[PDB]
Design a binder for this molecule. Sequence first.
Ligand code: NA
Ligand code: NA
Ligand code: NA
Ligand code: NA
Lengths: 494, 493, 494, 494
Amino acid sequence: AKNNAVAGFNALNGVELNLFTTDELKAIHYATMEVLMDPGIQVSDPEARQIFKENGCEVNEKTNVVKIPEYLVRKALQLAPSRFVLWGRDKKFNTVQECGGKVHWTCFGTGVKVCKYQDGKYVTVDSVEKDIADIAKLCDWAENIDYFSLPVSARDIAGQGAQDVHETLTPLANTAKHFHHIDPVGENVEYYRDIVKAYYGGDEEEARKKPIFSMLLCPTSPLELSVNACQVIIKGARFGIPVNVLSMAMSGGSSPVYLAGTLVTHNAEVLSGIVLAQLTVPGAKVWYGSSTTTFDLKKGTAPVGSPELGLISAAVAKLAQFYGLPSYVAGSXSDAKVPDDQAGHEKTMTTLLPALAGANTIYGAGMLELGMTFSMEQLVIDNDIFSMVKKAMQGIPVSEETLAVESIQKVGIGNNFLALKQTRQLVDYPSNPMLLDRHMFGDWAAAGSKDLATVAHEKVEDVLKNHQVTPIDADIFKDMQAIVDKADKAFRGM
Amino acid sequence: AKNNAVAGFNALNGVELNLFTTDELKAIHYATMEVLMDPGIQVSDPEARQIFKENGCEVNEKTNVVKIPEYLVRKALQLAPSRFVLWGRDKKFNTVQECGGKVHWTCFGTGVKVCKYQDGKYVTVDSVEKDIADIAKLCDWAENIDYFSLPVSARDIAGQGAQDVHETLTPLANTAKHFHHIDPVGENVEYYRDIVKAYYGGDEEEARKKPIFSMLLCPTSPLELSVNACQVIIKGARFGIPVNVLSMAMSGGSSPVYLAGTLVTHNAEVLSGIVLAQLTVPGAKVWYGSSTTTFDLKKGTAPVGSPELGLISAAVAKLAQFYGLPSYVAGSXSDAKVPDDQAGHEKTMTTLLPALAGANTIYGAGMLELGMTFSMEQLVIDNDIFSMVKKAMQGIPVSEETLAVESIQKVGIGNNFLALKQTRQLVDYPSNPMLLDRHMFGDWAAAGSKDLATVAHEKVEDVLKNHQVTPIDADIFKDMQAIVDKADKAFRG
Amino acid sequence: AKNNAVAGFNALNGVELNLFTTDELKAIHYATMEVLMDPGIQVSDPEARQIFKENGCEVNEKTNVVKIPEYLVRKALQLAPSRFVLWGRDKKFNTVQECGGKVHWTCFGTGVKVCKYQDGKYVTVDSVEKDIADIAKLCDWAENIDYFSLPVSARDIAGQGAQDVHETLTPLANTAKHFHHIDPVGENVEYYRDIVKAYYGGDEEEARKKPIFSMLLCPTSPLELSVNACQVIIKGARFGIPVNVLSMAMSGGSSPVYLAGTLVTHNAEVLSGIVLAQLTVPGAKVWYGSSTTTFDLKKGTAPVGSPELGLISAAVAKLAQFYGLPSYVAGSXSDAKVPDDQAGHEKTMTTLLPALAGANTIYGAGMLELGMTFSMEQLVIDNDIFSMVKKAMQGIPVSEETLAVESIQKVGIGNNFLALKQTRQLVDYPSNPMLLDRHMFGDWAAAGSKDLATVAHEKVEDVLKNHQVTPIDADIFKDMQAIVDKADKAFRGM
Amino acid sequence: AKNNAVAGFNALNGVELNLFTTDELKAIHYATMEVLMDPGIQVSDPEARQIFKENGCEVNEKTNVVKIPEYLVRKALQLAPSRFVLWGRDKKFNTVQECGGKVHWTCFGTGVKVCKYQDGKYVTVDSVEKDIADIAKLCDWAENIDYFSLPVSARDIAGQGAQDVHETLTPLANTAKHFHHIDPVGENVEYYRDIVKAYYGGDEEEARKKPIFSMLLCPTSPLELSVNACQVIIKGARFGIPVNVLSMAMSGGSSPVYLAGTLVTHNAEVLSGIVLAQLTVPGAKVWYGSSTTTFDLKKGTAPVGSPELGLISAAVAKLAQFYGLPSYVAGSXSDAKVPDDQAGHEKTMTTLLPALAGANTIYGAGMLELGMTFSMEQLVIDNDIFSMVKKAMQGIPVSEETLAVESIQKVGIGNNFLALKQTRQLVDYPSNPMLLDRHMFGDWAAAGSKDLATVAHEKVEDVLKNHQVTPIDADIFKDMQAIVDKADKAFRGM
Ligand code: NA
Ligand code: NA
Ligand code: NA
Ligand code: NA
């Protein structure tokens, strides 16, 4: 009869992308342990220095330099959890961050401009808190955007109050998905904590168990931890708020031209932050992240739509998998000023390498202009791209059924599979893009001979006009607004 | 002192892309050997059927179905060369096609329309032998295009002369790079042989030794070998011209919806061709090719800029490496009607996968509109994209030098590497795109706020107006031109 | 949201069992190649010797010793197909034999006695043609019995006609499954070809395309190919009949005591048979088979229900996979004289090793008494055993779905999965034995306190009395039956 | 000359069985860690909750639910010893339990009924303290039974005294092999400690250095730790008594139908016990154990002679080897009510998988009726089966010697190996079962046509009548018997 008994079989599910051998991973590690001991790392916050000192680090109090011994890096790595869950106000949006290759996406964060349509053209203008609400609504709709990362700055609130706290409630209000704050303020973490506690009716345990808010911080390249960064880490750990320690080194600028050497600088900085985190509160939820890229000597810019950004982010994901931590890297980025042929290429180049490598969170969707501008058109374009990427990540599934010899035989020479029952059952198996155009020249011309950007634009308009976002309870929202008012007051009363 | 003695070290040069385990490759293989025996393959050319029969295949002379035993597949694979060199008129354009991961690129082939600027916009018009000449010049300039593949059809010669023979001399004349004929005619292969024989001053040995010409043929899916195809294979092997057996199956159409099954249909078709080739002339140069894709039931078309094409082309390179043969697959393709955001995406999606997998030749550069139109703008864009893919393929080189600890220590905390000597020696190390814009908004606007398409268009212009292509010797050209005329004369008969 | 994107993932489907490293496989091989050149093999059939000589073998005509060079062994292996299909009269019984781990089972063959209940107990008596007809019917029912191998000898025909030809038509008439003749007679192969040709209305092409008959032969240990063995090979290749070159070596008797040495003897013998085949007709369907076992120096018998037999068969399956050929090995065998506790153990020991190893066909089902007797009871029992083995061969399928963390969480602490919808959907997922009793003492005693043996017996009766077999066309049969009568007359004509 | 210089050669000693890739193991791990945090584990004992809380666990005192952070699992796994020795009164019975593949067997534990021969037939009757003594004497004789595990309950002591304490001295007295108590009482652990201390004449150090006693506890599925379990873990750790954290989950009942999901449940449960142990006393000797099985909805029982049981037990060994701990799993089990064809099969099915997988201890020998009954016949039978399993585990040793080409060449074509000197020297190499019958029909019938069951019954009678057990020193036994009396006296006064 047809067999239904197969001895042990070796299989490959998806697509494997390799950049290192264990030997090489260790080489990078040793080099990092070497850097951590000399020069070491400049920890500007005194409270952080005391944490390091207490636990074994040598601390030069006049130069603020800390030398982290390898055993503390080991201890930290054994304390950090291998996974944690990001919650949304809508449980269906909960996103998992786990060591391994489960890839997820989030939008770029955080620009100072927005790419919008004025009088028959796309004009890049300064962003305002209002823009955040709109983008939050769009991302709430975009399926492939697992959670929300502060897209643009509420520049209009600058100097007027606690802008960072405004950048907390606006997002939480305009989307039910998890919120990741790219621009947190160390001294104001208590407000973020209070906002979330307010959402959960004053129940801090609830807030800790179902965190709807997390934050990011960047070590200062090369080899420094600013006062703000140290406080974000320490307060994140103590309040139970997921903290993303993301690097921002620059090859040929703040780190070696070579990528391996750059990863070393990145590794030293990120590990220092994670160590501080675990030393403050053992078991603190943390990300091993990066947006480190290459500096373009010949242009005077730090291109982030280049193959180097893709390779570096992919490498960082491999390093996080090597260390047992969840990763958060830059991807789906571009240096193009408009949603053109360039944006498409770069977005795909910088997203595919990190995705195939297994980055747990790839951020950059919707970004344009080397991380300066945010485009709603590019956001929906990128979202559709991730759908194509997820299909590719399916690789080739090999099984008696997928080989389908009987089908090939039933059809026979010179026929077609259109009528076949198996075929009609797999009607939804192939990739089905939302915006990408797969029509004959005719149908496309008759539709207006529109390009992707314009098609995307029409999509944005529809979403913003007809998408419903799960609103926060009328009363709870007031409790939350109260915290923002309190923050603005404290800010203005100097 | 500084170390200068390290024990055995395991390294990864480049970026490795894996899609199969050996057990899965075998499973696919068995499925194919199963299909080759039942239903088997329908060979239309009687000469080919005789070749197959003479060697052991069962040939039903009424249905024309040929059943190929597995031992013949093995014999064919033991005969086919693992590598061969493609020659251009200019030795500097020589390209190797070898089993493994050495990647190369070639333009698409062959469209019927051309996307060109008209009265303020890009208008897609039908192709002519003149268009071929222009593209050949553009590609002759594009560094990441190793050899030239027939881009568009010389439609203006249809029913007026031997179109295929015109499509042979025009390319050879307009570019010093090797030429790959996508639309050869079985009966006219001798014209081609002579064209080349002429180029080498009437020396056939030199033509065989330094082939500047090669052909492509497609088995008819599912499981068929048309008369034209068998003849291209037979004469190709007999004349010493590399033949590319490239599949054109369609998931949901001529092969199962599942990619694995599709790969089986493909494997059966391509191998049957390769078997014929080796049976004809043991040692004939051949390519394990593919442009197989999926059928969008929902859009009534066959998207070729999809993640599916990329996967298929990637898997075929792996099957090729598994069978010990050079590969030629679709890649750097798109379904967009214009060089927009969509084009850039699909071009990269379909090129990155086959490239990282190690496809020896990825073709599709310059193509748009599901393989209907060719675009010089997209072509130069693609060319720039390939430069970026090549940087990506460099991966992360790990060595004491690249780890650069001493540099990190010398620069120290809070400083920068700008003035570092090592940094200045590596000024050309980073990727440096030709078209892609890496400037800030200021400088970009100050340049007219141009998108990639226009920037590219301007490049096309500059190239077509100034690039110098090494021309064939006047005398020699007459000899070749003669064969074309002779062939056209015959056509009118 | 819930993840739906995973980077390359290494998986293990089923259970893998390993016995050798590539270095050890090669070691066995070199040993084999050395033995084939010295002392070589005694080919008693002059026609086969000729075939060998013509292709390059040194043949000593006065001793019949043929030394086979390694390049011929290589040539044969490259010529032999990696797979082929065994057809039944009922296409639904078709069975694939392919290099790899696709396992299948067939009954034992061929005994000279039958274990059956007489008057209050089991009595083992010599077999008769009628026994074959009943065992064929039984096996037609048993699902895990892919095809049918000549169970016992039609001993009552001895001395009256062509017993081997009777042994062909009876099986084919009593089951619609493919028939594997274990006692073919080199000289009568033409009769078998004709029976099958008759079944297909005189179409030899159809007979070659849909083989319902295949045969087995044994090299003579140590290192000999008898005339009968050579003729079965030569004619099978020439008539398009799948031939099983199966060894019957014996550790301590016809090969070294060590199992490696034994595999070397087995290897030389089996490969010589395969070479002959491919040299006779390139591409001839052949099996790499074995029923080689160890001799019990202490008991003066050849135990076939021992771990040694299980190990040998498993190793042979690995050697077959190593050489790229389908395997046919002894398994599910016992040395017990009755279907008892010993039976169950030995049957399981000797079937599990070869199954996990990946043997393409495991024969031995129904056998007892060291290969002398066939038991219908033990046959239905073995069939049930094969179901449990098929379940075990599933191993642990690891996927997000099978890990079911949500189910565990939804059910929570101190509760059960009985009402969970997922649970009721998998009502047929667990193993469900046909005979093995899983009832509480109460229900068991209430059913008669019957042991597996008698429960098995009751099943036999039921199947024999009610199972329906697809009959052969009355007229086609007549034509086949005629071939038998013809052979019987020629036989008597001495 | 003959070679005696061979470069690096890769070899395989034994039979390797594989079920998981490292990725799959990790996947089972993450799922388990996720479950240890939500829903977490219900620890009923208040002393245990304190132990957890003190070390960083979130403990909900109202629900008694403990959430174990991944860093504590890691810590416990780093503290637990990779190996430890089980002592017997006779140093020769000392059994090592070490992370890896060194397999050992022990009898089942613990039934409520015994399967014996009354008046012409086998009758299943309730057990008594005397039955423990007998079975202990039988297991003392069985060589493949490394140590003794409380086989049946001393029911005749129920309600009239400290049953468990009687179930301690009796075993120790009736066998000189290590004793594993399957049903220890948390509150009476001090009694066991004193009994052992008594054996070593008051030297508590010796008792700790040469443990002749160890115990087992079962987490309550799903996700629960009873007061008794916790006390066993804690006292065991503090007194220096090896503790076996053994799961008893059940697919489709207290855990998901899928095997993977069931493993997760098992993991969460067992690891919680191990964490408790290490936190109580770092370095405490423990086992990663299991007897988790499937539930047959179609039969209303939890079959333990199923392929599922074998798979689960084998998986638990692989997981243990992954975590670096010694394993103790169920195997050599059957659902049959009598020692018949079924018993033999299941026993082998469920012992071979874990054995080939490397379980450090497989318990179940002598058991019948889904874990309800203990059969001395099935015990000696199982013990013999293990001897066959041990031979199978030899796999194929490949060396110039075992390949024995010179031997093959010496004997030559068509000859015999019996007379060969090498063969005579290897007469004890082949498997030599004690009960399994390998005689030709004649000799067997002459011996009575006895099946394995009856043959076993005879060996039982012979052992029980003639086997000698090294007795405990008369004086020492007095002190020991005293503790038991003191325990009983205590039981009565309440
Ligand atoms: Na796959
Ligand atoms: Na590298
Ligand atoms: Na598995
Ligand atoms: Na071995």
